[PDB]
Design a protein around this ligand. Structure first.
Ligand SMILES: CCCCCCCCCC(=O)N(CCO)C[C@@H](O)[C@@H](O)[C@@H](O)[C@@H](O)CO
Ligand SMILES: CCCCCCCCCC(=O)N(CCO)C[C@@H](O)[C@@H](O)[C@@H](O)[C@@H](O)CO
Ligand SMILES: CCCCCCCCCC(=O)N(CCO)C[C@@H](O)[C@@H](O)[C@@H](O)[C@@H](O)CO
Ligand SMILES: CCCCCCCCCC(=O)N(CCO)C[C@@H](O)[C@@H](O)[C@@H](O)[C@@H](O)CO
Ligand SMILES: [Br-]
Ligand SMILES: [Br-]
Ligand code: NA
Ligand code: NA
Ligand code: NA
Lengths: 92, 92, 92, 92
């Protein structure tokens, strides 16, 4: 469980650094600093307004933004589910 | 199953009291009384418009609001999933 | 699996009849006929805009609407998850 | 796991071709080409704004659009969950 939880933290910090660099200047409310980026990527992970609210407005400036966000979703959504199931099975 | 269901009820009432106190005055439609608070925190748990609809408007007045909401989500989303899986396994 | 799938169909039709009757006149686009109601309740089940998009506008006319929708969500979200897990385990 | 992952890829490409053909002319931002279609159908799968954001605007032009989208959701949401659970069990 600890290895999976540490993997997600490292992935979350690398992604939030990457997103600050890529979309910070063009989208400062969502990715203007590391803290705004970490909060936004958490929102993207929970799936909340990920496309209509964040990704589509971003893609109008950065067409390839889907190469960042879609894999981020596919990985974090799998890892979180694997972490929760892992913690539940270990507690049993 | 009963212990997990009781844990969530106690956590839900403490959070909705806390939210009434913190955000009630500045956001009365969402946290103006305990009943509005319990409804909103349920909506936050289901992930529905949690960030674009509630948390981002709140953070514009209370910058640290994420310290309340993010852990609330992480805990309730884990507990509910643990309660549903627990009820399914016990029925088998 | 068949018993769970039949339980959800009966619950979905009873709810969609109830919602047509209760909210049809005041909210015709969402519950004006049985077909619009069945579609809306499916959207409510997937959690999509359930509160900001449907339930909050409804509650402004019908304050108690949460007594219908919250249990509907709690039941269908549990049943669907139980049906999917049940179908997966039976296939193994 | 490989058979389930290949089934989803074939289903995703057939659906995105079908959606390009059906809704491309009337809704070009969402289904104007295969690339836009594949992105939108992924967003529909994650449940993000599927009804208020995409399906309801589409249904105002194509009333039967629900015959495409509802089964697409029911199938992909089941398959993805079956793929993730399958990958987790195989890793154990
Ligand atoms: C894993 C999930 C980690 C989430 C961390 C969120 C941090 C958000 C934050 O620090 N700010 C909000 C930025 O909007 C700045 C307030 O000072
Ligand atoms: C999980 C528990 C959900 C309880 C919701 C209670 C909502 C409620 O009582 N009201 C809605 C919020 O106003 C007040 C009504 O009287 C109108
Ligand atoms: C279980 C899920 C069943 C979903 C059934 C949806 C039926 C929707 C429907 O028939 N119409 C859409 C109503 O907006 C009327 C189009 O003629
Ligand atoms: C699951 C697969 C998701 C694939 C998304 C592909 C999206 C895409 O290629 N574009 C976005 C939709 O335009 C076109 C880009 O060239 C801009
Ligand atoms: Br989470
Ligand atoms: Br479903
Ligand atoms: Na959602
Ligand atoms: Na969801
Ligand atoms: Na939403």
């Amino acid at each position: 469980v600890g290895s999976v939880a540490a993997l997600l933290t490292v992935v979350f910090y690398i992604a939030a650094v990457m997103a600050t660099n890529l979309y910070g200047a063009t989208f400062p409310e969502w990715f203007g600093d590391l803290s705004k980026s970490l909060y936004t990527l958490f929102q993207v992970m929970t799936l909340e307004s990920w496309s209509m609210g964040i990704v589509r407005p971003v893609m109008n400036v950065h067409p390839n933004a889907w190469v960042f966000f879609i894999p981020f979703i596919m990985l974090t959504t799998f890892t979180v589910l694997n972490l929760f199931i892992g913690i539940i099975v270990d507690a049993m």
